[PDB]
Amino acid sequence: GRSVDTMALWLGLRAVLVVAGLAVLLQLIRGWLSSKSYVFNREEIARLAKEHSGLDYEVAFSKIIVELRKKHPGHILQDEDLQWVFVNAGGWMGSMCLLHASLTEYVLLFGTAVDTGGHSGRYWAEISDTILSGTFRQWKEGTTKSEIFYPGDTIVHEVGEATSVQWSSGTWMVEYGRGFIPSTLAFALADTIFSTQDFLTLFYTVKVYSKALLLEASTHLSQLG
Template identity: 50%
Template structure:
């Protein structure tokens, strides 16, 4: 009986915390809007540059528009999740939002992950294919297309070689870290890269805290 009671207490506590977090996410204000990130990216893509020049223009526009909300010294980092491997360049990270560049030079496939977040990806080069859960058809996205992932959604995903995109996420970002770090922790055991990812995310949270509290 004591074990059963303890289990019920854990379930009730988790449910209560989830409900509180949901209310907080629904009521708080956000720095970015998905449609703004998409519009900035689409404008850069329309110029017909390569992915490096497009990324540079998007970053410049984000810095001009959002100032100190963008991290000062981003760097490309490897990330392994759900069996796939890619590179990411984190421009902003907080408890509830992130903006990053993502892609792969050689292609990759795997599990999308199931997140407590809304995520949008705008393809600036290459092809991205999704096979949504519960279907028998895959959907292909190409340069200029935007893909929206809603909370709880999951899919098999594939990036062709030289596919690059701009991604914005909004939700309870820490809930995505278990998936984001699991392959690195238990498969690749690249603890140097694990440290780099955690370091950048922590710096992002501290950077955003400074903006919210001190306006710097």
């Protein structure tokens, strides 16, 4: 009767429980033992973006790209491969311009010209965003109150952390990610697969990721000979 249905539902819930739990455990295991080859550090990127946050965010874009090319030659994409690509993830819609991406790091420009917001994602990667323009509202897990950050501030999305994020129209930021980068792809592409059906955007995303990987491989080969 009712007790039988309660017990059966409890059994199925425990099934889903152990499935999700072992998925989380595997994510932790793959992430912790992942490689950690670091060309950049988040403080360098944050300071460089903060210095230029008072300028027009596109002038700041240019200046930051030029500085990153000067300080890390061989690790930033040429002008021919820079492209603004929409990003639909976790219920929000923004756009990115990828500057660098390896197995363990990535650097990009990110933002939005529309009001948007949603789930931040939960992956084995430390993400950091320095606002050039607009406002970034972060609502952390386990709290009932949120915080709003402004140009020049840096929000650090910690490893394993999950938040709600919200950006206002005209919000632009410099983003640096460090960790097990491929484990973020499932989050970054899911709304494209199950919501937007925008396969050309998927094409653009994997194209720029592959080009960044090929640049890193080419620079590694040159550094070894």
